[PDB]
Copies of this chain bind each other. A is one copy, B any other.
Amino acid sequence: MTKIYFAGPLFSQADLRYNAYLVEQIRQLDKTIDLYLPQENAAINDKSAYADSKMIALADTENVLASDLLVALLDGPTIDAGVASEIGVAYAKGIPVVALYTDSRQQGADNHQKLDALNEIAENQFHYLNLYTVGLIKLNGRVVSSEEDLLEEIKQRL
């Protein structure tokens, strides 16, 4: 069996719903996939339950280091800081990362007016990802821009 850690923000309803939607597609791909989704394991917010950052980081890292493959969602105004740190841990431990990046503002490389606009001040139409975090992914993994490509890449790594 292949153990997958699904890295991604899990705090808003938009992200919670999208994670569950993607994960079910990944789990229906192959019965040997053992995917760990953090939102499925978080304790319901109770007034007596508490864990500090050290406990949080230690428990989260244990799930990362136990996986064979990390699936990371990079979308947002910036890459989620927790996801970025998890990618750094995975790279240093040799765990491959397949990342999904669907931002519609990444398209336009064939649009010569978008390219020319870069000569103007504050006219860039291409969304930006921190290239250090991206480079760590590509040094052992891949960044895909569609759910179709993500499922195929996970399938080819089984």
Interface positions of A (Cβ within 8 A of B): 9-18, 21, 45-50, 52-58, 60-61, 73-82, 84-93, 99, 101-115, 117-139, 143-145, 147
Contact = CB atoms under 8 A, between A and B. Distances in A.
B123 A12 contact: no
Contacts of A56: 131-132, 135
A107 B128 CA distance: 13
B50 A130 contact: no
A54 B120 CA distance: 12
Given A78-B78, A111-B47, A125 B121 contact: no
Contacts of A113: 48, 50
Contact of A122 (B53, B80, B109): B53
A17 B46 CA distance: 30
Contacts of A102: 12-14
A93 to B, nearest CB: 5
A131 B53 contact: yes
A75 B93 CA distance: 27
A7 B53 CA distance: 20
Contacts of A129: 81, 122, 124
B104 A108 contact: no
Given A88-B89, A117-B52, A134 B12 contact: no
Contact of A133 (B13, B82, B125, B132): B82
Contacts of A132: 53, 56-57, 60, 81-82, 85-86
